[PDB]
């Protein structure tokens, strides 16, 4: 399908400035299908880009190639994992001889671990694993074209992520034990998203579950496809208006800390995750916990916290769609208050609902919530 396109210094400055100005760390994927006669990588176009970025003092990290397991399908060229590893070594040499010799390198951005993909990854890590800082792979639950509403709400669908993650670690622990593993591109449904589903409240079950599982299973970074774009799996739509997943992501950032713990129901359709609270939130202090939960039951469920947290002051942050479109809404409410940017430069505050000490935690049908346990004074969090 896709033909080659050129891009300019100008384009690079636009992208860089967007990242710099937004407080984001840019990772730039280089074109791996530029090939020599021997089917090695022609480093030359990359060399030109690097020199340009070096000359501008741009702090950028790098990838090489996207879904190389698909090169045959996409471009009628097959690059084995071995060779791709060699190509990465060549990129590493160029980076170390540049003005930014301590720039980071990630790859290979393979698709979800089918057998073919898992053999390409294994051979890549043997060959080129010494020079990458993290292993990147991609995951999508469904095909955008065919996805249904019930798919987005089905725990048997959510659960397949688990074995994908396990399989990636099985490859990495057989080749480069202890190498960090990152989701380099990930969303609900591939091929640009599922319309009226990947862009709605309903997309949030997959997104929050993914975050929870990722953290719990050892993934270090998760990169949502996309922030902005043509695909329906965007966080921000064509009119620069945020969608429910954006608001979910913002709340996650405000509340959820870096130290991952564990929560479990005693009984599949009720999903529960636990971290230390983000201490950078001025409202909360060292030792507080952030619980988050997903209710895929068709009735409200009531959660009771274990000793010694049964009677702590808890702040609820409950997300529910603004009607009438229910789970297919593109609008969301926090504790009954619709979330909307105040103006083009101003995010709203995200207002808690303090609960009665000693009350059970209500989670309505088909909803998700965060709960901050104040004065938890948990040692692991300090």
């Amino acid at each position, epitope marked *: 399908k896709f033909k080659n396109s050129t891009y300019s210094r100008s384009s690079v400055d636009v992208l860089y400035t967007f990242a710099n100005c937004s407080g984001l760390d840019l990772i730039f994927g280089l074109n791996a299908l530029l090939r020599t006669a021997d089917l090695q990588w022609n480093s030359s176009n990359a060399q030109l880009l690097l020199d340009y970025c070096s000359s501008k003092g741009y702090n950028i990290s790098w990838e090489l190639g996207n879904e190389p397991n698909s090169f*045959l*399908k996409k471009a009628d060229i097959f690059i084995n994992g071995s060779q791709l590893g060699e190509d990465f070594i060549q990129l590493h040499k160029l980076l170390r001889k540049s003005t930014f010799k301590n720039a980071k390198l990630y790859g290979p951005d393979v698709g*979800q*671990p*089918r*057998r*073919k993909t*898992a*053999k390409m990854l294994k051979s890549f890590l043997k060959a080129g694993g010494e020079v990458i800082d993290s292993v990147t792979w991609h995951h999508y*639950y*469904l*095909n955008g*074209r*065919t*996805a*249904t509403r019930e*798919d987005f709400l089905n725990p*048997d*669908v959510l659960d*397949i992520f688990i*074995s*994908s993650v396990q*399989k990636v670690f099985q490859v990495v622990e057989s080749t480069r034990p202890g190498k960090k593993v990152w989701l380099g591109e990930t969303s609900s449904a591939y091929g640009g998203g599922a319309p009226l589903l990947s862009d709605t409240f309903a997309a949030g079950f997959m997104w929050l579950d993914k975050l929870g599982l990722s953290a719990r299973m050892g993934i270090e970074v998760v990169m949502r496809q996309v922030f902005f774009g043509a695909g329906n799996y965007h966080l921000v739509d064509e009119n620069f208006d945020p969608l429910p997943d954006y608001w979910l992501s913002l709340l996650f950032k405000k509340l959820v800390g870096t130290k991952v713990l564990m929560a479990s129901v005693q009984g599949r359709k009720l999903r529960v995750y636990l971290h230390c609270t983000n201490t950078d939130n001025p409202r909360y202090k060292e030792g507080d916990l952030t619980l988050y939960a997903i209710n895929l039951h068709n009735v409200t469920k009531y959660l009771r916290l274990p000793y010694p947290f049964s009677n702590k002051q808890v702040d609820k942050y409950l997300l529910r769609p603004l009607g009438p479109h229910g789970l297919l809404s593109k609008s969301v409410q926090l504790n009954g208050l619709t979330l909307k940017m105040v103006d083009d430069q101003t995010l709203p505050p995200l207002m808690e609902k303090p609960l009665r000490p000693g009350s059970s935690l209500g989670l309505p049908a088909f909803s998700y919530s965060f709960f901050v346990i104040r004065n938890a004074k948990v040692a692991a969090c300090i």
Partner: antibody
Amino acid sequence: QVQLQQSGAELAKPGASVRMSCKASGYTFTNYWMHWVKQRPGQGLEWIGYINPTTGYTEYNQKFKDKATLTADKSSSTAYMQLSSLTSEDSAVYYCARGGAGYDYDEDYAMDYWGQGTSVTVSS
Amino acid sequence: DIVLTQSPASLAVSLGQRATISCRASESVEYFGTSYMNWYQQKPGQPPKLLIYLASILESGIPARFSGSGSGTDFTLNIHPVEEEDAATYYCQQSNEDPYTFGGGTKLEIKR
């Protein structure tokens, strides 16, 4: 019993297209991968592609990729395959198989039960 | 696109004796420690049916006399004894990756 019943034999004309069917019975349709296999008239046998009916995961044979369009139909326990730009190369028997317990690629290892095959004939 | 090459293309074998069909592959058909080979049986005017999966596992309804062995790239179907019904084209197919490939096909005559 576990059983796939494909459409009746089709005598379509050159350059045109046709839709083959493959209804499944005797098991939960959505919990199994359906492959499609092509048999040139007494000339051998070849795989075309599989599809999961819950997820939507299609993978095709490079050879047949621009010719074949596997579609499922959750509602009626049915599966389909469309064939475009028909030549005499496409005059053959097409089987529809099964065999993947699960939803993920690595969960399909072998094809269990098969269809009766649909003879497609292309001459005007 | 592992190349599947089926060593005998036809073989006449005598009723009661053992028939030994080879299947070879490019690359290797083994992920973790499991060899993803599959054997079928196209009766004359009939669809193939699965005989043995993962190289050495007899599917259901399949008699105890059909026996798969091998691993890596070298696989072997073995019928003992040979009965009249067994006459067919036998296919070895790799499941090891996408796309799946299929061997040429070894046909069995009975020496009546």
